[model samples]
Target: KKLINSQISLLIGKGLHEFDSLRDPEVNDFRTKMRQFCEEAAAHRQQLGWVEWLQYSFPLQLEPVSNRALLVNVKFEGSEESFTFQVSTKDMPLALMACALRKKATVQPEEYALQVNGRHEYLYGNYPLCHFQYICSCLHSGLTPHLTMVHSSSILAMRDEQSNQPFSIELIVQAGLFHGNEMLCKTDISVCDLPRMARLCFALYADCPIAWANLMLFDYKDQLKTGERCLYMWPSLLNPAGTVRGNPNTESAAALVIYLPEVAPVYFPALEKILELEHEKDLVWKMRHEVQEHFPEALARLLLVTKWNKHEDVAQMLYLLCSWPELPVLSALELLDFSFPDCYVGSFAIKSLRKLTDDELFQYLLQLVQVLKYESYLDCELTKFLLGRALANRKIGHFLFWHLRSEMHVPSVALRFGLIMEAYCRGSTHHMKVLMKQGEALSKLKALNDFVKVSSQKTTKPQTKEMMHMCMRQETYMEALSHLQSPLDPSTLLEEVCVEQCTFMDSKMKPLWIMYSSEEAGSAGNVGIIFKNGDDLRQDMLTLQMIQLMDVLWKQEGLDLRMTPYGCLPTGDRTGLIEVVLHSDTIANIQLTAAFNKDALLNWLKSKNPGEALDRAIEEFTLSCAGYCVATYVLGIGDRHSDNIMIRESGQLFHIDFGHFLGPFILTYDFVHVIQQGKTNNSEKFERFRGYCERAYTILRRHGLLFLHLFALMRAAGLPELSCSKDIQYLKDSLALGKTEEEALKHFRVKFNEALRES
Candidate 1:
């Protein structure tokens, strides 16, 4: 009902600069049907009272491929030989594709793939061409697809073929809505296709429409689903490269399980066997040849699903996971997080972590410091790794000190950090004075906050939210302000402002907007920061840093989102300094005079800016929107009530309070209104707006592995929602982690539509 109600209310709902789905005939009709029905329905009868137990699900149609077999053009990788042939919906194209490749000696089939939508290039499987065609229709419906052959040879392919028995698995698909419960038997010549095979089998046999059907496999394993959600199959252990040991007729064991309406290959992933080093005794050197030949990335993945401690020949595999230079960096990072049980694996992960540069290390410092918690001992390589880097570089050295310093109160391990801190200080003792000043800075801040807390109140209570500037600035804060050091830029010291000089901001935590006096050229300019206490700013510091890194990554691709990665430095447990984003007004504050309509942001822009200045601001606003749209969308940043989003007079729009992310955004109306320019119909600029966004999506998606590693590494940090690997899936899905360009774009387009419709 909330979705239905809000969308009905919004036209109406959504974001990202895109098509005005609001004006689409189908959309408008749905809106009309919804409003008309609601107006006359029984549910509306209780409008003035309790209208409970309501659920209205909207019908969404994104895929509708034609039923007949269509002609698909084929192109082989490695060589340019290709052919065009008519293929049916229900047939497996792998053999035919391979046959054609071998038929002309132009090149081997390598891999049968679909150039989906005639746009996104995704390598498909040798499985049913039906779902492959289904996906193509959504992406490039009605167009002749350039069916290309792409390629893989991970544990997914070899583990089955290598085994003596034709290892196969039975998908005990519990009842689908349209069909009875039955076991779909699938064999192996490959790795994990359990997800595809199971879903296609059921949809081909049980259901009619393809995308609407969901299929899941079971292990009788996980408690929640009675072991049903086993999508990717991992055996108890890989045969230590020796014999035809297990039953040949054994099920595929590959259960690549997932509860999907059969998503693309990127959706259900997991697999392998190459005398895999899961057995502790499994010799690394023995399979090193094979490991290199077919297994580095795949082996690393198989090693992940490899095995548990104690009995695992993980040492052999450990060498493989650790030694392989070409192993997927993403896989290595996941292995790093996954190996929290002991030092060996995490250290192996560090082997990969070391490949990152100093700047990258600085960005990872916060999480790396927290990553220390997982260590069993204080002297692990990560510790020395961070310390070594910290001593040589001032930036990371500074943050590394503070991140660890914050954990000083953890009584039992204070000595560990105490000793580490001493090592850090002794090594980089030259900058000791500023570090000293920073400690005093917090102490002085504590004193000032306390003084203001008891500083007798006026009309709006002085304690919180409503803050009052002291009438007489000269004496009031002078004592604490006299020599207070700026944590933000330690070289600057606070000016002994008269009590009234510093203004307090109206916020849940009343913070002083203090002025600063800098070194020689820094003419005591009011370099401002909102000084605060009684609020946890660690997350703010962490979030701010990540945002800044994103801006850096974005600029690397030459797309400037005008990201306001303002400096937030934590001086202590719950206190910190936030560098001000000046000349900006919150969207909510600007809209106070108006409703949620487009007029609010537009009029506000008119008042503060004039002529070229105003136009440029609008331009900046538009460009910044696309970046924020892609950024905020992937970060899952939520709580968009206008307060956290702000715009500067410079026309730059940036986000504030990365308090919670990987959740949500709603400021697009302001953006759309700006893009729409109050015009009633089709815009002169939305496609480009979408173009910027589309490009932004691709840019971020390419670097997504880096971001994923960052988040995965930061899991131990105290962000609320990011407590587990499962939570990370939100980001993975949004980034379309493993999707092809078209697939990722398709995903973004749908999201863009929903954002507009839901807005």
Candidate 2:
């Protein structure tokens, strides 16, 4: 809280309401705003009209990016009495501005003109005060009222050319469209002409180039009539007739001339590079509000528009304006890029994730785990947040434990984050004692695997053999595996029951095959998982979670696609757990059982789901197959052969192991025939199947914004295919984002036909 000058109140009441008078809703609004602005600044202890409030927000010995704000003593043409005040400029002009000011001023003559007599020239209402400052002795001077009013008869035409700039307006299109504003190129059209005014005017208007959807354009006569001052929406439309018109000199002038009713500025490259070059920043504070709509990607980058790699005021005001929530999961989650690792970005990211269920959070848990390393706590802002979620769900708790424990070796956070891990497990460890038994069991497996990792090493004994756990024998490794109980909670010992096989499978990394009995286990043969390593499961984990989300989204829309959302948990960096789909065979194995013809799947499903109940089983297969088709196409998940496609005894089908992604290639004729129920193209069965595919495709398309943003948020994690937003645009393309529902459905029909090798 700060103090205000007593003069501020009187200045606001009559001064703002008078000059800001159009005497309508816009009048009451901006007047209210000016009053509020004055009130806000009063407590700041600095003079209110100073644009340095921005400087206060981020102190960098920087000039206000808008301009030096000073009070102007504006007067009427016939009288000595004047209205003097200071205001923010550029981020508005004289004649149209006078009407804006004159709506409340006691002035007459719609034809009256304003003149700043450096040369006593006819001032275009749109000319900024700085223009006059250049032409007049107001330079290096202050508190002058030389601006006088007159008629426009002397100038034969409005001198619009005075305001146009030489073709460069930087657009830091801070949109969810790309990774950081993709530094849109400048508009340097050769020589200004008819369209150049309209063209460049629009380029100057929208920060995002393709933002036609957000901003609209229209002819003036249609929207309003009998107004002395007006803002034009198009170029060439301005100054078309015998009317006073102006070109864009400042952002305010251009927008005032070009603005219709609604609108939204530029962002730079990341703060680091710009800071290196000594960039400056403005009223630019509102781009956060602007870009948040069209784009949310470069939010942090747009925010600091930093001076160097340093500055503190941005974080202060960043917290001030951003106290609520409305970020996309992308906008919110993307904040953890750790570039601006402060309460500003991280705290908001917490809000976005705060809305997500743990299952959703698990999708990016690996990346988030790594992100935790980036967050250097000013307080326990991040630690407390992660800990709360960690304590909430056991699966989240379990993986959170492993991710933290995996990093226990790191010198930086072993202690810093160790407390987070320590408190997290204790509160819960205090599922935790039971989980500790599982932890012990897994650690015991790791010791055994450690022995095999060397034992299986083919480059036999050198001096290394002496170093290779030289003291431990197979008996000790076996002894390590012996009395260990299953992590899945079986009181029975593995040695007594052969947890799958009593010993760890020496197959590759020697993964343990743990077998446990369930109280519900009379018919249940296996409630087990493989604890293993090699290859980052996070990649598959990411995609698998996506499909599970895909499954969830599909089910919510009332379309049951029967996706296999099997659990795959990552314990550490590359180590994790894989759920065994106990009684299913790969398409490769099942396909070979009956040649390459359609009978491969038919024979498998008919015998598997079996004779009498066959119809309902294939019904499940049809819809499930339809679901897979849409999800595969939408995610572009591909490189399918018979091997990875697996089927269950219940006749459910699913795909696994995401080695190749984003290119949707497949052989669907087999399923087409099977789904067609041996019927031809003119059949209801295939028609219904096609409808299912089309509906699922459309449904996914409707929710594509959510799906697309999920990938957008993870761009910082740098998945090769998912690296930049341009790479992710493929999903937008696949989703047919802006396509009409009918058009999108037609799009799916074409692809489904392609899969069927249609006529």
Candidate 3:
């Protein structure tokens, strides 16, 4: 959707070809083969004790808390390894058993075996069978595991060093026999230098830190009193050479020693302080980083939603969560709840969920439940999960349980009853049954005997409030009979509804009035009010932006723009009034006051002359009069009178509406300018009409592109389109027309290419 100059045509063409390149059957076959290779490679990695499905990196750092101990910061890339991993004592126990049973001096690397194909066996463990359980028990120490095989957690120093603060760290294996497995078996253990072993042990025992000294964060004042140490741990193989060379002993006997930095917690204290400043945001970010790999990136965001603060960062983070490359859409739904108010996001999520099978949605919900933890807003979070599951599968029973729980404390019993009735009437029969069953079940279920009583039923019968009467007004609508059909029959249900009489008089009833109101306050004030209040300023800028759009369209359509309406309104009233009255075909009382000055309402109501500002305001309008039209979604007037569009000597223009300017808006086919072939052009009528249309489009294009790009720059300075429907495409398409003008040099070679040159 990004706009480019005519020069970019070469690159654009190349990009388009690349986008469609795979559509070629030969190319598609190549892609399929490549995908197969990728799958096979991943399977091989798993066989070698590497979980290739996860593509996250492990992070670690050092901290010198005190002379007595250190701190190790631990972090991971994805949720898969973050929460669903299982750091079982079973793996290490099994590894020890394998080693003891072999009783061999040296173990073959391939011969090593442990749980889940992780190769964790010791090459030489000069120990007895009885000690196997001890190592196995130690394996589960300082770590927590999930359903998946990933094992991770940080270890903290029990106390601080006398000279300095204490530290903490966590472990993860990068590459080695035991690197792929938690179990300590004979074949998995590499004969390496002590330094490598030191890192390996530290990773298993501590956490790591990330290096970014610029984050001037502060420390917890409470922590200073307790004398806590901060540290980090990176569990990967420190020796990059290890990946290329199998020999672990090349680094000498230094592999098992502790690695520490002089100033351990200097930056951490500051970082933590900044995190505290934006606690909710920091918490979400921290949690997201911690549990990133368990589920897909889209679903992983559920971990952060436990905190319910409506932080700006929360929305931004949600935007990021939704941007996961190829992340399944249902996963997004699992992380959010939906209601009728959120029908848009819900429907989109549901569509995505529908793309998946019932098994997929069910499995997704189960995954969400599996990852749920007791945190802030725990019950609300659980409810969101339940709601998503219910929506995906239309499991009314499940949805009813959560919905009832959520709406239990209604201040208006009557309103609640009405809502319940409405729900009963509108919901599917199955859903209605579920609702009834749940209500009955709740009535029979025992109430909670907690501090606050949860009653099965209230003793007081709620007052019956009358439901609001909704009068469906029926207006008389008549359709002319077809050529072959009979005329209307009086006896056949001809209903005459009471109709409110309205005059087709010129008036400013549109939200577009805001533009005039804003302009009345001065141009700067006008710009500020709009840019400040509207969510989509770029779009709101569309009204005035139309001038530019019209410019582009005019020029693209090969129309000369000799005149244009531009500039500001004059301060004096009489001169401005004279200008407008002279240019406009008629002095429309209502429109005159609206476009010029609403303060002259008395004169307009009396059909008297407008003050001087009328003329200046009309000239200064700049399509601002359409604001109300756009705001109210009733701008059909501007779409009509295909020929009355007028352009002045300065390239300024204005439009007049006819009676046929409205209706047939419900369908796309109603759109006009549909290539009507074989129709002869009336030179006198059509030429002038097309000329004005072209000029307006031209001026609009030139100015529209400029302003739109400007507004877009402003928005990009804030935020860009994180999703679709952003009008970015439409603008690009418009710009594309301009580019073609340059390419064919239409101004130079119009006659040669005009026949086929169309947008």
| Top candidate when judged by lDDT against the true structure | 1
- Candidate 3 Cα errors over 4 Å, as ranges: 1-542, 545-652, 655-708, 714-726, 737-759
Candidate 1: regions farther than 4 A off: 1-288, 292-302, 305-312, 318-335, 338-348, 351-355, 456-485, 489-501, 505-508, 517-519, 522-525, 592-597, 606-608
Candidate 1 structure quality by residue, lDDT tens digits, 1-759: 123222222211112112133233433343344334323432232232111101101011111165666565566545565576666655665655665565456424442333322221243344555455333442322444454554433212422232112213344432231111122232122123122212222222223321112322311121112322433322331111111111122264333344422222233222233234355335544555576567665554444343332223444444555456644446655655523333455666677777777656766677677666544334457766776666444555666766666665543334445445554544432344446655655666676666566553444544332233443242533454555545564333455443444566555566777655433212223456787788778767766676677778777776677667777876555777888765688887877644655778777887777766677777788888877777788888777667888888766788887767766345356678776665655456777777888888888788887787778767666468776678778878888877899988988888888888877
Provide the overall lDDT of each model, using Cα atoms, as 2-decimal numbers: 0.53, 0.49, 0.26
* TM-scores for the candidates: 0.57, 0.53, 0.19
TM-score of 1: 0.57
Question: Which scores better on lDDT, 2 or 3?
Answer: 2
Kindly provide the TM-score of model 3 when superposed on the true structure, using C-alpha atoms. 0.19
Weakest 10 consecutive residues of candidate 3 by summed lDDT: 482-491
Please name the candidate that would achieve the greatest TM-score relative to the true structure: 1
lDDT (tens digit, per residue) of candidate 3 on 445-536: 11111101211122221110010001112111111100010001100111111112101111121101001111111111111000011112
Q: For residues 448-561, could you state the per-residue lDDT of candidate 2 as single tens digits?
A: 557656665655433324333332234554355444333322222233234323334445565644444432112232345666765455557667777877777777777677
Worst 10-residue lDDT window for candidate 1 reads 50-59
RMSD of 2: 31.7
lDDT of 3 at 402: 34
